Design a protein around this nucleic acid. Structure first.
Ligand SMILES: [Cl-]
Ligand SMILES: [Cl-]
Ligand SMILES: [Cl-]
Ligand SMILES: [Cl-]
Ligand SMILES: [Cl-]
Ligand SMILES: [Mn+2]
Ligand SMILES: [Mn+2]
Ligand SMILES: [Mn+2]
Ligand SMILES: [Mn+2]
Ligand SMILES: [Mn+2]
Ligand SMILES: [Mn+2]
Ligand SMILES: [Mn+2]
Ligand SMILES: [Mn+2]
Ligand SMILES: [Mn+2]
Ligand SMILES: [Mn+2]
Ligand SMILES: [Mn+2]
Ligand SMILES: [Mn+2]
Ligand SMILES: [Mn+2]
Ligand SMILES: [Mn+2]
Ligand SMILES: [Mn+2]
Ligand SMILES: [Mn+2]
Ligand SMILES: [Mn+2]
Ligand SMILES: [Mn+2]
Ligand SMILES: [Mn+2]
Lengths: 106, 99, 99, 87, 98, 79, 94, 109
DNA sequence: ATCAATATCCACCTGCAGATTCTACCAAAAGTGTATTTGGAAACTGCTCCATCAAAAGGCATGTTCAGCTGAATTCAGCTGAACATGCCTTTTGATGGAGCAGTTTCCAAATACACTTTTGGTAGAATCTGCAGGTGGATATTGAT
DNA sequence: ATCAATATCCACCTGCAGATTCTACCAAAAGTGTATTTGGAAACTGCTCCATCAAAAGGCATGTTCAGCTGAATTCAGCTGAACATGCCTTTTGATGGAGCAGTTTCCAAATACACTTTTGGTAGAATCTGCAGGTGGATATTGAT
């Protein structure tokens, strides 16, 4: 008869654990019952949106498996993710190909 | 008869080479050596988790690769193609670092 | 002789679930997974923190779905926040229908 | 009871061609001869600031080992967040 | 008729306004400005006078330092005249852009 | 338009305080664009702090909190 | 709707360092913001320290590390000193 | 019974050891606060206030003012290598800037 | 560099309004005193994970030569932006009137916190699966010189 | 506009390292039930904040002049990039010794929890004082002319 809250909310992300983490991190004396749900959803939506673009980036480089380069390409080419992660370093990500035009011959 | 690339051509190939890649660019033993020297000046007989030196190396290389983008814009703003210390200096100060 | 054991917790199983939902054929390397795990933990803190501020700011002892939502509006660029605010509201109403 | 070799002058181990590879990823086509000592100066300062804090996290935890997390926490304080090591 | 050489009033003006600490945008067009922008977000919002005064303080400092930065960029390109491209570069390097 | 209320002689004073000796003509419209952008980011956050408190007045603290989020901490109106 | 500032404490400290000098109201509120600001910087870092090491308690040891992380070198050194001076004198009184 | 003596007094501080204890509690920084934490913190806070007002005051006497105003705070902070870095990303209302003219802009003669 | 001639700043004084400092109270914090839970320092202790050492390969850092091309310097014109006086107009500033509010107080339904007792999802090794790193060779582009 | 010399692309193969799938204990959600908060829903203020109105004031928009700055064109010395031999030192990989994480237990020094009892910080008129608006009167800077 047990029914996991993640299941009740239709999420992959562990609503239960997210509840535990809000508590034992001391953000407030008490936590509302809807807060871990909403939070677990947003976490899930953001990992979904990123993996979407990173998967696209692996296929365009004929790879099955996502690697940190694909995370980096997906992130730095998406205007909004790039803002969200403007001060984040992705280990083994590299940079986006860019040569100032002033530097090319012709 | 002997073949020669005009100066700048090999540079542009390298820029393309290394922007396409994600390998670490500083050699790994000398960097580790540098880190243990520095860390040992703050506290003696420390040990390092491997992942900690690699974290430090990734962080460093990321920092410098990016400072070089900013330095490069500074040389260009001054109608040059060559980076010089004043470009790094200008960049570091606008950024909010110093000395 | 006797033996000792340990236990770690990550978002890996969930990240993999969501990965399969969008790219069923695609996989993910460990370094890539680890980066993803780093991302969730990060965003988790940014939101929880901002939420904690909002609660303390209004002399409230409780973090509710609403503090989370406002926090989300502050940290996400519009249209990432618009979608996120959407997905999250969907989850709370669904969670409230079956008790 | 035994000792290592003294660690000294290891910033010179950050060689010129490495400094030239990094600038290439950074999009530099041409490099002044004085750049290489500047970089070394800047790198050293960076590493000190980052490691100091990492070690401070270690001293606080009453450890003798610097961990990846110590370095990730250091990097977060310093505003340069690193993903992929406990991030 | 007496005329100061171009640049002499400027070095004098710099001294005046660096020595002083008054707000430099005049207050009403600014208060007016802040109110237009806010209703791109909600209506019958109301403002503590101290709240608009806070925003104005935040703005001028921001613009004054950007102007310090723009100025370094201009001097770097061996100029004395700041241009849009200098403001562009300074904001890029700061991280507000590109 | 109210952005045009932020006039040339005002923008020139800021530049004078910021130590600029000579100013190009394209600067003032450039400046207004940047001031415009600044004011939006800060106010968007401030009103969001207001709406959350279920208030209709933007407070000084609302602006102070916004400015803290944006990394530009302001002293003198609460912290 | 009672308020609270550090004003009287800043005024007290002001008079100890310059007896003759006073402070405008705007200047005082700037100081009030300073105290509030640093307070949050140190508390947060101390909260972070505790949680990292799976600890429920913020102790003077946490403040001290936090102070080390946040303050510039010669200022960390004097602050770390002053704070120890304050705890010791506090233990003295039994 | 017995006769009360404030924790601030016991520590030789002007700053409120009691209040700093309450604020640590009600800020949700940890489940518990040790008795040494607010003492230490309040001391640290007092010290930084002293160092600022010391230098900010010296500057008021140099403008023949009885009252410290934000300008002197701004003078004191931005002219001290360390206070300036601590407060590196802080705006001081009514502070102004430090007088500084980039030398290239001054006349050749 | 001196000389003279506007033009602008900037110290020495000085009464007065707007603030600061001073008096006189009180609720609300802060302190005490007593009784109890309890987080985390200590004392081991199993056992990953680190520190060296080393051999052998062959990848790259180095040092050198040399010329292409960049940076620095000069000169110069045209065109932009400063300075200035004039004149119109937006902004300050100074009360006033009244509504739309944030801020309180107090009451209960509804929500969250705990403590046990199941019950299941998540993790750690173990056992399978399998991209793709690495090593190639032929084509296709690119560069630079006749 | 061709050619020789290079380098870059880009697909083909395949065991193996690294990723997936699988097993089985068990930590941690979930479900229950009792015990506490709490964040409202209505009812009330005082108080900021808008909404106007209208003097007077600097401050701003204008238009003309011309200084001098920015950018263009040229010249040249020397620095930095390309190329290649040489050999150092990093990289791999591997075995081994041992520190010191990290896992556990047990127990006080230290925190939390009420209950009361002072004592202080905050608040609001009244009672002094410091900048401040202004006024010089004088120096200090600056410009155009010898
Ligand atoms: Cl911004
Ligand atoms: Cl009790
Ligand atoms: Cl050139
Ligand atoms: Cl007069
Ligand atoms: Cl003559
Ligand atoms: Mn060759
Ligand atoms: Mn899909
Ligand atoms: Mn303590
Ligand atoms: Mn009066
Ligand atoms: Mn008991
Ligand atoms: Mn225990
Ligand atoms: Mn040779
Ligand atoms: Mn030559
Ligand atoms: Mn001319
Ligand atoms: Mn199961
Ligand atoms: Mn390959
Ligand atoms: Mn294997
Ligand atoms: Mn009149
Ligand atoms: Mn050699
Ligand atoms: Mn009192
Ligand atoms: Mn009192
Ligand atoms: Mn005066
Ligand atoms: Mn005056
Ligand atoms: Mn003449």
């Amino acid at each position: 008869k047990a029914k996991t809250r993640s299941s009740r909310a239709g999420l992959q992300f562990p609503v239960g654990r997210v509840h535990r983490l809000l508590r034992k991190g001391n953000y407030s004396e008490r936590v509302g019952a809807g807060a871990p749900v909403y939070l677990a959803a947003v976490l899930e939506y953001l990992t979904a949106e990123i993996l979407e673009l990173a998967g696209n980036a692996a296929r365009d480089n004929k790879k099955t498996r996502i690697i940190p380069r694909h995370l980096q390409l997906a992130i730095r080419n998406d205007e909004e993710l790039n803002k969200l992660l403007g001060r984040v370093t992705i280990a083994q990500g590299g940079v986006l190909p860019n040569i100032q035009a002033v530097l090319l011959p012709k | 008869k002997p073949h020669r690339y005009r100066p700048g051509t090999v540079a542009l190939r390298e820029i393309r080479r290394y922007q396409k890649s994600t390998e670490l660019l500083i050699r790994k033993l000398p960097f580790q050596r540098l880190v243990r020297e520095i860390a040992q000046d703050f506290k003696t007989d420390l040990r390092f988790q491997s992942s900690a030196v690699m974290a430090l190396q990734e962080a460093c290389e990321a920092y410098l690769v990016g400072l070089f983008e900013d330095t490069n814009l500074c040389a260009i703003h001054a109608k040059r193609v060559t980076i010089m210390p004043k470009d790094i200096q200008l960049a570091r100060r606008i950024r909010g670092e110093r000395a | 002789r006797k033996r000792k054991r340990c236990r770690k917790e990550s978002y890996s199983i969930y990240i993999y679930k969501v990965l399969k939902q969008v790219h069923p054929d695609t996989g993910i390397s460990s370094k890539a997974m680890s980066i993803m795990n780093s991302f969730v933990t990060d965003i988790f803190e940014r939101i929880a923190s901002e939420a904690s501020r909002l609660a303390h700011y209004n002399k409230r002892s409780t973090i509710t779905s609403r503090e989370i939502q406002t926090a989300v509006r502050l940290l996400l660029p519009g249209e990432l926040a618009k979608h996120a605010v959407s997905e999250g509201t969907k989850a709370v109403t669904k969670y409230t229908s079956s008790k | 009871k035994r000792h290592r070799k003294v660690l000294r002058d290891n910033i010179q181990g950050i060689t010129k061609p490495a400094i030239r590879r990094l600038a290439r990823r950074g999009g530099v086509k041409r490099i002044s001869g004085l750049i290489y000592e500047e970089t070394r100066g800047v790198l050293k300062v960076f590493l000190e600031n980052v490691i100091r804090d990492a070690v401070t996290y270690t001293e606080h935890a009453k450890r003798k080992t610097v961990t990846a997390m110590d370095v990730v926490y250091a990097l977060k304080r310093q505003g340069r967040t690193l993903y992929g090591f406990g991030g």
